[PDB]
Enzyme design. Sequence first.
Site, PDB file in Angstrom:
ATOM      1  N   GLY A  90       0.763  -1.317  -0.088  1.00  0.00           N
ATOM      2  CA  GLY A  90      -0.135   0.000   0.098  1.00  0.00           C
ATOM      3  C   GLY A  90       1.015   1.289  -0.038  1.00  0.00           C
ATOM      4  N   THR A  91       0.161   2.495  -0.196  1.00  0.00           N
ATOM      5  CA  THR A  91       0.663   3.682  -0.107  1.00  0.00           C
ATOM      6  C   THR A  91       1.438   4.172   1.238  1.00  0.00           C
ATOM      7  OG1 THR A  91      -1.277   5.079   0.360  1.00  0.00           O
ATOM      8  CG2 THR A  91      -0.743   4.519  -2.040  1.00  0.00           C
ATOM      9  N   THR A  92       2.335   5.048   1.130  1.00  0.00           N
ATOM     10  CA  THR A  92       2.886   5.613   2.582  1.00  0.00           C
ATOM     11  C   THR A  92       1.813   6.351   3.315  1.00  0.00           C
ATOM     12  OG1 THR A  92       4.919   5.561   1.183  1.00  0.00           O
ATOM     13  CG2 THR A  92       4.891   6.524   3.548  1.00  0.00           C
TER      14      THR A  92
END
Lengths: 204, 241, 244, 196, 250, 195, 231, 243, 226
Positions: H29-31
């Site tokens: 997933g994204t940060t």
Amino acid sequence: SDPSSINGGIVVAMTGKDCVAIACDLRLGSQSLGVSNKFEKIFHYGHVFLGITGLATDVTTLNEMFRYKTNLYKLKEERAIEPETFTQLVSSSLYERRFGPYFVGPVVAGINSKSGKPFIAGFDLIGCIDEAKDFIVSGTASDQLFGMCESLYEPNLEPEDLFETISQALLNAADRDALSGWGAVVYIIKKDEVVKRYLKMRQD
Amino acid sequence: GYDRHITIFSPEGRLYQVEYAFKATNQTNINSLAVRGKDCTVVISQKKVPDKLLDPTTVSYIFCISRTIGMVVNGPIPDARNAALRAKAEAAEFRYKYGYDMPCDVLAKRMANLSQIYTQRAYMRPLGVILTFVSVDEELGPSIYKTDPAGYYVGYKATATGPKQQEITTNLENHFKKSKIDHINEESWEKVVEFAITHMIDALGTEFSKNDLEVGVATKDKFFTLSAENIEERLVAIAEQ
Amino acid sequence: GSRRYDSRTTIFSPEGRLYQVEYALESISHAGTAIGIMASDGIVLAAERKVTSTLLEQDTSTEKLYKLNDKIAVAVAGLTADAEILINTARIHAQNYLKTYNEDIPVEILVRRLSDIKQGYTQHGGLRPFGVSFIYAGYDDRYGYQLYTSNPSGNYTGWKAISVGANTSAAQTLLQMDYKDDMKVDDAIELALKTLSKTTDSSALTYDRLEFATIRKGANDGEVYQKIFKPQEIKDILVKTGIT
Amino acid sequence: TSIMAVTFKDGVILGADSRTTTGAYIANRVTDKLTRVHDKIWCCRSGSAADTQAIADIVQYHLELYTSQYGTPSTETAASVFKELCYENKDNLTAGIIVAGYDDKNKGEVYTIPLGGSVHKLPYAIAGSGSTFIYGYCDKNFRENMSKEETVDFIKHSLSQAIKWDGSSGGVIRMVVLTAAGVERLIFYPDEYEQL
Amino acid sequence: MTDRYSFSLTTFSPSGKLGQIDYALTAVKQGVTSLGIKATNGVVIATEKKSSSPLAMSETLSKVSLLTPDIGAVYSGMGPDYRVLVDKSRKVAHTSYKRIYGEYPPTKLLVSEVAKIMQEATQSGGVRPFGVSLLIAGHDEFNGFSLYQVDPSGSYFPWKATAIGKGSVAAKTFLEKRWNDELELEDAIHIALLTLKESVEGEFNGDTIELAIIGDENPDLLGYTGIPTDKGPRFRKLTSQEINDRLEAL
Amino acid sequence: MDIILGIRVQDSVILASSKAVTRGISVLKDSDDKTRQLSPHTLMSFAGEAGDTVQFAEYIQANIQLYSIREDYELSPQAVSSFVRQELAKSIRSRRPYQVNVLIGGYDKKKNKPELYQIDYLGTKVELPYGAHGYSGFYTFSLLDHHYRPDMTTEEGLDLLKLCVQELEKRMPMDFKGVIVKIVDKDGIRQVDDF
Amino acid sequence: NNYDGDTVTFSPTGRLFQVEYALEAIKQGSVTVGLRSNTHAVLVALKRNADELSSYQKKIIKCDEHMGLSLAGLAPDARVLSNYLRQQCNYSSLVFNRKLAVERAGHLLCDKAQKNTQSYGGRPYGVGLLIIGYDKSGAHLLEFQPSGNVTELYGTAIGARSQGAKTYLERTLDTFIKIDGNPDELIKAGVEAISQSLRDESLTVDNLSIAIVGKDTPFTIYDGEAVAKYI
Amino acid sequence: TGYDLSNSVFSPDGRNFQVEYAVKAVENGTTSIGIKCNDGVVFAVEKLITSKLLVPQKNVKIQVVDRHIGCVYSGLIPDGRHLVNRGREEAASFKKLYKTPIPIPAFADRLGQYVQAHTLYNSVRPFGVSTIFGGVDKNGAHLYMLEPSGSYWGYKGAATGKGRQSAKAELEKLVDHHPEGLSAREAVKQAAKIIYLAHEDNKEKDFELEISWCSLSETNGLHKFVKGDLLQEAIDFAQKEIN
Amino acid sequence: TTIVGVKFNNGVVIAADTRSTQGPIVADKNCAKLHRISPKIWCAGAGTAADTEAVTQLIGSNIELHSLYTSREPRVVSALQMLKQHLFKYQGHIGAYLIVAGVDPTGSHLFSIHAHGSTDVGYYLSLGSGSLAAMAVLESHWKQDLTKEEAIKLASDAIQAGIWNDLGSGSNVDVCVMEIGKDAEYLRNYLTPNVREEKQKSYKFPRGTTAVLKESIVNICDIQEE
Ligand SMILES: [Cl-]
Ligand SMILES: [Mg+2]
Ligand SMILES: [Mg+2]
Ligand SMILES: [Mg+2]
Ligand SMILES: [Mg+2]
Ligand SMILES: [Mg+2]
Ligand SMILES: [Mg+2]
């Protein structure tokens, strides 16, 4: 209206020397109307005897219930139930219907097969045990029976003398009650013989 | 080989999921120790904060179950907190129903029965934790009772749990062989904590700072955990003799 | 999910057999032999206890012959614990019937009820079947003396003489050979014991390895008596028939 | 019953009589109506004894379980738990409860919960059958930030009058003092308070 | 969630074996030796207190448990399974008997109830069998003294004397030679201690051995006086000292 | 409904039941048969609250017919009466009890005996030589007490029944529109079409 | 492979194959385009027929007077999800006298689809939805995936060959967003967008399905000779 | 083998492979990050702009629980929403009974026990999210991070997603260089920088920055989104630092 | 019914009369009203007699199981808590009014319990129809630091006040003494001040006085062999 006095009837039990006696009238009615003169209120499961007064449908139902329960008891225990144990069973069974009770006045009578000790007990409709030494009374002429038993009874009566005492207690009590009578039965119970006697009484 | 996936018997009469739950117990790489004084029960446990981003005050495996009962856990924190929350609920319910504080050994038995159920019922997995319950019981006095994923439990004079439990156990065994008593003959709990820390240092062969340890103390009518400064005072006393 | 571990106890094989019923029957074939023989004046139940010990308390022991009511008894072959679950259910059914109609339950009605319970475990629920085969010995005023058998499938049949458990093939042949319709109880007692004595896997048939019972109208006048034989009484009948 | 709770400078004091009646018969003349739900959160009970005991026991359980998880509860939180039970079960309860507690942050607080199950935070509260007779006296004599000795006198004099006029109240005057210093129980006998 | 294991985990294999029951019996075989001997005027049950650690207080771990005032139980196999069975056995003695008949159940019927619980774990959905064999000793008025064994299958058998667990085969042979129908309780205790010594490796004393009896009524253990018919429990657990006294006359 | 009578003679049971059905102000029917055949040799008459009577009678009928098919066997009158009693005894403690009183007249083919059972809505069962429900007994029992003999023929039983009905027709305020009479014996159940 | 037997199983790389297989059903489905301006929002859907005798499967469903969607994939699943939207829109109106926000409608669809991906026994929804609507914050277009992912967009397309229409809208972004107060021109842009996803077949009178909602325009679907204007 | 096919199964290691596989979805997933400041907390997240068709500032990822708690997560977005919905039920029932808004540590355990419950059975799947959350209560500011296993701890700074290593390193510098503490307005600026620095792991597509914060002085202890001028100021600061 | 409880130096004593009634009729002249919850926890009951016996057996049963489970002797507070929560649940429909007394490791205790579920603590308590007569005696003679012998005297005197002055109470005095570090001693019929005098006449009938129609032997034995 009052369920315990629609059908009428009485049961009395007494202890004697190495014996017990239990007796009942034979009447079943619909209030004023006499319906049956053969409605016996005493039953037995092995050597344990149970009298039941009150609402007749419940008398019949409870007899069938205790037959049911003492039969299963016997199959599992491999022995006949004793009066002391059966008394607790009757109490438990009545109390489980605490807020919807059977309208009855049961009376247990018998002799313990091992100790030979005479035993009687009575209950209210809800299971409270009355374990009297002398006598137990139940039914629509219970007041009359209390009066008769209290004066006529003496301890350690022989079987054939006890028969006369319990018979006279029942008969004269029933004759002062509109909803009792129409015949009577008396059981004389000893450790290994039981005699059943039908009494002659007024049929009104 | 599905007899190794759920809690049913293997041909050897073993429960592999229970055995593997015992192995998860040492996943934290933390050692705990518990000892009894005259008026107290002390429990110490290694505290390791590997990440600098962590708030060290929240990193704990010691729990205050009730006012009287404390619990240290050996195993992963999610299962530890599962057990902690349940034990707290059980301890509170007990007091409400029966009108007195739940004893340490009774709670241990209850949690052990719950664990037993997970070893018999297939849909529930065992918790990968060993639970060490401590208190000063009003009837039995200082008490240490320990539960595991098998549903086993027993009382202890003293005990140790973790990867290096055997080294600590033997160290404690040897001391009680000398003294020939079932406890640390000491008046103050402070000195019982000092004993506990000293014998962990000897057994493990490692020195401790104030942040390397975590301490729980049970006295009559309360269990409490020591702060870093309370532990520091303890470490100073050890070094000065 | 859970599906992975499901044995699926209630399915057909490609041949149209119920796996678990067949395997339960295989289990029952290793159980001690039980024999029932129906005569004109009574029924005999004879059964072999499985490799016993000298320290087993025999007089208080019961693994084969059980009482359902005063008129009906059963001989068990298979898992004793499974049988007792069913036996207690049967005892209750008999009492429910007695309470309802104020008459003792007819033998077949009781047998059908228990057999229907067994059937249910083979068709629904996903549970293993009961690893039990019964021989029912009983009496009622409609059909008189009756012998039945039921097995884990829930199928039941009526018999003049029958065996269940171990060596039923050998046992049934021996019974088929010596049985006759005008036979009496005392003769049936002898046949039952002779059949067990030949089919047994033990070296010799003794009193301590047997359970025995008779349902007789040999009760004082028009009524039926169940007799579960005591260890000493089994020892006597073994001497009488000339086996020991 | 005559009960009251009064906040003051150092915290809060709960006060109560000790009479419990079945009709005109005094079933218990030494009743303790000041009950503990937490270390420094107590309550005064009026109404059905069975109901208020049952409620108090449940609250004590809730605050014990609260403390195990989240630490010491506020007096407001205790009052909320009382309210939740009284409000949701209003059809089957006859309970009039005053909740009093001491925090260090909030100091002394008093909450009254009448029959309906509503909550009212007050400087002081009075309740029970005997409270009717002292609304005038208490309103005239109450001051905020009283001393411990003044608050004890205020409660003693107030309940003395409630007891004097209310037949359902009587016996001893029990009091419980809640401050930072701790929990102090006080008792005052008829010979003391009747002559006031 | 929900218990989605609504199917049997014990099933018949092609050979007719119930695997999980056999494997449960294998777990019992690994368990520490326990035994029971019946005398004319009593019953004795005994086992070894196999202490997992010397730091553990073995007195807190009770292998021999009171079920009713006149009935006691001991086991071989998995301890935790035993502990919960004792809890259920104690409760069922009340719920399915004492609350109905106003008296404690006879030994055989309590055993029957325990057996039923064990049978159900052998057939019900999503459970394994209990990994224990129980030896239940007891007394009641009409059946006298009795000793029963209960296996993982739910099968139970009455015994004059027997043993279960680790060294059961050797122990049963030892009991066959010594047992007779004229044994007094003290003689059975003596034989029990002799039999149990063979299967014990290390220390053999009152602290490492657990032993209880079903014998005479103990009015000193009743806790009250005044009712003649109430004469006290027949179950009594022997103390550490009481065992050591009989080990000198061994 | 109103009047139901029963009499057990030597070799049969006779049930007499009124024909009237009254809904308050009007007599809606004067030919109503207040009875159901439970089995070939068992007849049940009934009286009580409207709807409940027929609903109960037909429910019992269905259950006995079901038993007859399953076992290929006719239950004894005693067995049928015990079943019926239990249903009523079950009913009296229900949410809304069956307000129904019944007479069960049957011929036991095993014992070769006629049998009459009287059961009220409470489940109060009695075996009798003659019986009734409601006020019917108040008028008729004195006549039955006097004349009844256990060795009466069917024809004599019908004559005694006529006398009972005549007394009812004389002293009862309600017009019950006569009775349908049915006889239960070894050959089964038949109706006396002229009465 | 071994981790696609049910929705409750992660793969070793952290993938949910059953959800991905459900996503595949959308790609097999017929193309549908969504796009909006500041005043209006438009759905354009290429309907698919079984054969020449058969009717063309309906693609667009009305959820409320101000909201509706177009489907691509399993049509029965769209019926379930659209029915759920109808109920939620209706609950908002009846209880709060409030038209359901399009963004909140997306949140509800996300959560409903999510429960089917985390529980045993069930299955993911096998359909993708393009929800358009006009609420108190103007025109809106959403894209729903049965993984649970809902995305607010200016324009988009789902189904077979949808990439062609999606690239076109990505170029035309600055043009069609400015088509305010002109429904016909916004539909033209949608019809021109969906045309980029056609091969072999072309837009006929019973093939094309168009829906529109806007400022003073209730959600209305156009089929048959009503879309001949735009062919 | 076969231990990794079913949830709640212990491998011979004593591991739950299904939970570890859920972590892989989180790592994919994204940060997203969290920064604990002097009197509150700051949350920030990387939103990958997959296409030009995405409406800016509309697809909001950060969620509010009650009025004082902020939640952000990386991994399967729907799983995060499911967890927040549960959190909101937990916070509502706590406030219903106890009156006071749920304390952050109390709230943390409510999520923790719920996520842990999804590792107890094979009939459910573990959560495919790591959730960073926190806020201000009566005992001050708190920042937490919660993993698929149910494991959670308190943090000074937290990070998860594909660019977590980059973020963590940057957070560790702030902890070292500011022992006395960081201000709320500073934390917003630093949060913007860290997301921009952590975007190197997702450098293919451009992104949109989203920041929220709870602060006793700046927001009265309520959760609020960083909007308009304050957001642009943080973006400018972030863009200045990367160049 | 008259029942009392009295605290003393090293324990507690309870007492009760022995008359059970049905309205104005005396059903049993020697009823046992002192019931055992556990060996050293006893209680006396008033109100609906079946409810008092039923509720003490149930709690007594659960107390026994609890004692076995916890390996600890039962406490009076546990009996109190279980009784009150049961009675409260049934909202007074279970008409049990109890005086609970006993000793345990915590010490000696004395409580009263009312049918709706309320409980009270005290050094001296009385319940039943003769409670006012009994309480009058207790209020007149009770003091702090009573001895065992003084408490038995006070308790039995309080029951006597009920026996003589209350029509609902009569016959005999039962007592049970629970002292710390000792077995509880149940003293059935501790006092017997109401023995019936010899009657003026014997009412034994001559044999054959009753008229009989039929005689028969009843078969109580099972179905016989042969
Ligand atoms: Cl438990
Ligand atoms: Mg008369
Ligand atoms: Mg008359
Ligand atoms: Mg499991
Ligand atoms: Mg109330
Ligand atoms: Mg006054
Ligand atoms: Mg009748």
